[PDB]
Design a protein around this ligand. Structure first.
Ligand SMILES: CCCCCCCC/C=C\CCCCCCCC(=O)O[C@@H](COC(=O)CCCCCCCCCCCCCCC)COP(=O)([O-])OCC[N+](C)(C)C
Ligand SMILES: CCCCCCCC/C=C\CCCCCCCC(=O)O[C@@H](COC(=O)CCCCCCCCCCCCCCC)COP(=O)([O-])OCC[N+](C)(C)C
Ligand SMILES: CCCCCCCC/C=C\CCCCCCCC(=O)O[C@@H](COC(=O)CCCCCCCCCCCCCCC)COP(=O)([O-])OCC[N+](C)(C)C
Ligand SMILES: CCCCCCCC/C=C\CCCCCCCC(=O)O[C@@H](COC(=O)CCCCCCCCCCCCCCC)COP(=O)([O-])OCC[N+](C)(C)C
Ligand SMILES: CCCCCCCC/C=C\CCCCCCCC(=O)O[C@@H](COC(=O)CCCCCCCCCCCCCCC)COP(=O)([O-])OCC[N+](C)(C)C
Ligand SMILES: CCCCCCCC/C=C\CCCCCCCC(=O)O[C@@H](COC(=O)CCCCCCCCCCCCCCC)COP(=O)([O-])OCC[N+](C)(C)C
Ligand SMILES: CCCCCCCC/C=C\CCCCCCCC(=O)O[C@@H](COC(=O)CCCCCCCCCCCCCCC)COP(=O)([O-])OCC[N+](C)(C)C
Ligand SMILES: CCCCCCCC/C=C\CCCCCCCC(=O)O[C@@H](COC(=O)CCCCCCCCCCCCCCC)COP(=O)([O-])OCC[N+](C)(C)C
Ligand SMILES: C=C[C@](C)(O)CCC=C(C)C
Lengths: 601, 114, 63, 114
């Protein structure tokens, strides 16, 4: 049995032509496979394509058809817990061998063979290789145009077939793309070729097991170039005009009237492309993808028609609430009850509005606490502080003043969330939120370590005063020493000597060492860190501000009720000529630079 | 010196104004909180509290923003721990955050301006 | 962009120092067993590695 | 020559020797990397650790990690048979022991302070 395996491993043709003369004489069912994993000698010959590969598989199939078994084990199953679904055709297509694949197809193989396996369905990208688990999608994934033409030009090729994940061919082509264009992308052109060669609309309407079309899948995974191609797919042929999303109504030199399609792009359906591409910041590629034309003009016109007067209305309401919260405490007795009840009503309203938001969010957006999740926490804390302070006010308690003071001190510092309206201040606010969590926190931790280490040393260096009045030592406890060290860290004073310390020279030496470590080292390298951070941030924070404004627009869109959502897009095309089910958008875009370059040559 | 003067006129209107607006927001928010935290002095001579009004608290916060002093504790405040916590938070937000990112902004501006 | 090299090298030196700290009996955490592919006393002591190169594969298959 | 190339600082020669694959049966013995199976982008490389693992005397890993003075010991340390060796060494041990050392020193320091 192992002799045939050794023959096919290194392409020993003479060994196999001797074996096919010796074996069948003893034969006059044949377990030619490995009998433990299902690896038949066809695959074992085809993982390693030796120079003599044609004749060996030809005589092997001739021996198979001589025993009336060629139609039985040609679709051999690699039955192992990792693969569980391989066939000879799958390996033949993968190994860049088209002839052998053509011969196997002509001999008769399983054209639609699902290669369902754990290794073939990896949990992450680096765990394994995902290719759609079909020979057709494998041929399309590994840049094999001739083989995919041969596979598609066949009778029983189930093109509209979905694997265990439910992915179609186009889902598989989307999942094997790249976030950034490598300038030699073949997945986009193979998507184009497959779309035009077969399938009208049900091939792209098939949904993943997650419930996504290839358009939504390309938006969610992060494939910017595929999303750009699909959202701006123009076909000028009348036969394939229905497979288009952009139509040029008229072209006049540099100006153009593109009629973009918003069938699944506008956020009027469930899990729209705009909502998907605006709520998945964790892949970080959601501004070069958000800058595409059908999304950029959608967000801009959404911001013009609404979500801007409402943003200013929200800022005005919060400003009035904050100023009437301030004037209640400042003008408090050591007639105007309308303000004293407006604070309660608005605090309760914003408390429940932030409570439903704090309960409806996912743990994914809490990463790095940057994706519009910190401000919800601070707004909820301020709201709960106001109502709780009111509760202790009615109960004739004493701690209401502390909670209300913290409430209004937090409220005036929470107005920085409303500065997204302006671009210039939006850059400043996103820089605030970035550097406090990136550079300030590390410096604070290091300085706190250097504070409580020197704090207890100086506190333990000095004993109690001889008069026991706690005035001649100035460091009588750990908290006192911590405060007195921080005061000279700011640069206020109290660094003088002779503080009743038994070792004045050592106390002075420790004070000088702490001064060096804080003022010369930590306070200076903090300058170093942001100084290096901003040179990379000043061109990147524009993406974050634009994405934050887009998320604000989508949030305000979701806030509107059903009856007020009559601000939809342009009406029907009437150009489909089949029930006119399309809902498009009129766009008049100008490209002066592109026109100048095109007309120059 | 013409380079220095045009840099003066550029940075005062580009970076200093934004920092001034943010710091003014952080000043009048903490200014009224500390002013409302402390009641009047028992002797009513306006010396044991050091924060008897909003303007007084604004001036005393700006003085320690420069780094002159008057940040000591026990200012007749009913909540000394909260008053200290608010003072430390204001010190962090001004000296560590705003005064440092202002350095960041012109630092990035001048490399394009020079 | 250079301190990453120093931190990685410091961590690697820490790993080697902790490896040298372990006694002889606790050093039973060796690598994968013999090959059996040398076919001459199988004296080799190899390591199994399953590495992925998606970018290299994409570039190779593109042409 | 392997240890000499690691000690002197020759990164490209060390990379070539540590990943020297020969597909000829006559010269298969003069190899250190064997591809068990290749499947598209994934690959199963069977790297050789005859003198690479720090179980012998003056191993290549110890040599390439203890000679920082030539400064070329990270582009040389990032090679696959060394990088995966250090990573898996850090996963199996030398990480629980690092945290144990930190915990012991933290307890010692806090009980010295108290
Ligand atoms: C006693 C208590 C009884 C129970 C109370 C419960 C619940 C009572 C009702 C609670 C909701 C209050 C109104 C909606 C709302 O939240 O408005 C918000 C803004 O939004 C607006 O200004 C738009 C309001 C809706 C559209 C109105 C027509 C606008 C058309 C325009 C055409 C051009 C303001 O409230 P907020 O959201 O708290 O704002 C701060 C928070 N935020 C900044 C994070 C957003
Ligand atoms: C105290 C400190 C607290 C806070 C300081 C920060 C203040 C934030 C104020 C936000 C206001 C806002 O976004 O409005 C916008 C318009 O808004 C209007 O035109 C509103 C029209 C009135 C609507 C009234 C209800 C109907 C202003 O936006 P803009 O800058 O005019 O245009 C944006 C685009 N640009 C930035 C690229 C130019
Ligand atoms: C209550 C607050 C505690 C909050 C702890 C979690 C903080 C998460 C954010 C953060 O700063 O993490 C950072 C680590 O930062 C640290 O190591 C922080 C040090 C401890 C907290 C410092 C304040 C309290 C000091 C004691 C009292 C992570 O860094 P990054 O910037 O998220 O990305 C890292 C990669 N990069 C540096 C190469 C870019
Ligand atoms: C620039 C770089 C920024 C670095 C920032 C970090 C630096 C920090 C140094 C802080 C110096 C003061 C701390 C010791 C004094 C103190 O308040 O002690 C109190 C503890 O108080 C607490 O436990 C809370 C103190 C504030 C917590 C940190 C603020 C937020 C930092 C984010 C208790 O003692 P007391 O109140 O002094 O008097 C005792 C008697 N009494 C309690 C009955 C009144
Ligand atoms: C040696 C390790 C440190 C020993 C510290 C104690 C030795 C000593 O005399 O300390 C001195 C400084 O000592 C320093 O300045 C020590 C710190 C610097 C060490 C060199 C760096 C303290 O000198 P002093 O305060 O003049 O000592 C009073 C002498 N009496 C207590 C006996 C009356
Ligand atoms: C009396 C004076 C008020 C004067 C108001 C108009 C100022 C115009 C100039 C200015 O700074 O505008 C800037 C915004 O700047 C702001 O948003 C300023 C914040 C309010 C004024 C701050 C001082 C008063 C603070 C409260 C008391 C515009 O930025 P820019 O630099 O002109 O260009 C923006 C684009 N870029 C940032 C990407 C380059
Ligand atoms: C570094 C970062 C820079 C940040 C810069 C911004 C920071 C600013 C903080 C300013 C601190 C002082 C303000 C409160 C004190 C004050 O003068 O109050 C006075 C108000 O005075 C005014 O209304 C004008 C005060 C100056 C306006 C701003 C200056 C230009 C800023 C561009 C009134 O009170 P008084 O005079 O104290 O005493 C009352 C009794 N009397 C009126 C009868 C006398
Ligand atoms: C919870 C929300 C804040 C509650 C504030 C009041 C609670 C409290 O005791 O505050 C404390 C600090 O309190 C802080 O330091 C609060 C700010 C830090 C919150 C955590 C971050 C104030 O503590 P205190 O000044 O020692 O209080 C005196 C007690 N007496 C008034 C009953 C005599
Ligand atoms: C901007 C949000 C801040 C920095 O956490 C404000 C904190 C202010 C307090 C706790 C009084």
């Amino acid at each position: 049995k192992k002799r045939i395996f050794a023959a096919v491993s290194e392409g020993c043709v003479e060994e196999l032509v001797e074996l096919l003369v010796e074996l069948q004489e003893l034969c006059r069912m044949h377990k030619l496979t490995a009998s433990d994993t299902g690896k038949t000698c066809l695959m074992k010959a085809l993982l390693n394509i030796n120079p003599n590969t044609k004749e060996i598989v030809r005589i092997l199939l001739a021996f198979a058809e001589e025993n009336d078994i060629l139609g039985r084990f040609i679709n051999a199953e690699y039955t192992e817990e990792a693969y569980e679904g391989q066939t000879a055709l799958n390996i033949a297509i993968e190994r860049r061998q088209g002839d052998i694949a053509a011969l196997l197809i002509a001999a008769g193989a399983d054209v639609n063979a699902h290669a369902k396996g754990a290794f073939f369905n990896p949990k992450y990208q680096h765990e394994g290789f995902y290719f759609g688990e079909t020979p057709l999608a494998l041929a399309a994934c590994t840049n094999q145009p001739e083989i995919v033409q041969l596979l598609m030009e066949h009778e029983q090729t189930d093109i509209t077939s979905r694997d265990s994940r439910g992915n179609n061919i186009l889902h598989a082509l989307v999942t094997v793309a790249e976030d950034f264009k490598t300038q030699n992308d073949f997945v986009k052109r193979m998507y184009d070729m497959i779309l035009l060669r077969s399938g009208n609309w049900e091939l792209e309407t098939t949904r993943n097991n997650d419930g996504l079309t290839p358009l939504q899948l390309a938006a969610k995974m992060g494939k910017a170039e595929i999303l750009k191609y699909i959202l701006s797919r123009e076909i000028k042929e009348k036969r394939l005009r229905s497979l288009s999303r952009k139509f040029t109504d008229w072209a006049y030199g540099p100006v153009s009237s593109s009629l973009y399609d918003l069938t699944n792009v506008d956020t009027t359906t469930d899990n729209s492309v705009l909502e998907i591409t605006v709520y998945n910041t964790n892949i970080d590629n959601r501004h070069e993808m958000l800058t595409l034309e059908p999304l950029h003009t959608l967000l801009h016109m959404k911001w013009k028609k609404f979500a801007k007067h409402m943003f200013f209305l929200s800022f005005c309401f919060y400003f009035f609430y904050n100023i009437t919260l301030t004037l209640v405490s400042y003008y408090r007795p050591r007639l105007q009850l309308l303000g004293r009840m407006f604070v309660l009503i608005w605090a309760m309203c914003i408390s429940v509005k932030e409570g439903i938001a704090i309960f409806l969010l996912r743990p994914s957006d809490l990463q790095s606490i940057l994706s519009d999740a910190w401000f919800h926490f601070v707004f909820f804390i301020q709201a709960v502080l106001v109502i709780l302070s009111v509760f202790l006010y009615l109960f004739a308690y004493k701690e209401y003043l502390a909670c209300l003071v913290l409430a209004m001190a937090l409220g005036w510092a929470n107005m920085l969330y409303y500065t997204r309206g302006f671009q210039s201040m939006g850059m400043y606010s996103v820089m605030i939120q970035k550097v406090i969590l990136h550079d300030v926190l590390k410096f604070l931790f290091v300085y706190i370590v250097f504070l409580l280490g020197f704090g207890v040393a100086l506190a333990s260096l000095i004993e109690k005063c001889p008069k026991d009045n706690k005035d001649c030592s100035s460091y009588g406890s750990f908290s006192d020493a911590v405060l007195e060290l921080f005061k000279l860290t700011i640069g206020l004073g109290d660094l003088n000597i002779q503080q009743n310390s038994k070792y004045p020279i050592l106390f002075l030496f420790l004070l000088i060492t702490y001064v060096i470590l804080t003022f010369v080292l930590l306070l200076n390298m903090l300058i170093a860190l942001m100084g290096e951070t901003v040179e990379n941030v000043s061109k990147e924070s524009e993406r974050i501000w634009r994405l934050q404004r887009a998320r604000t627009i989508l949030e305000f869109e979701k806030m509107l009720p059903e009856w007020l959502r009559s601000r939809f897009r342009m009406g029907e095309l009437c150009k489909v000529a089949e029930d006119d089910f399309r809902l498009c958008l009129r766009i008049n875009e100008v490209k002066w630079t592109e026109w100048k370059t095109h007309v120059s040559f």
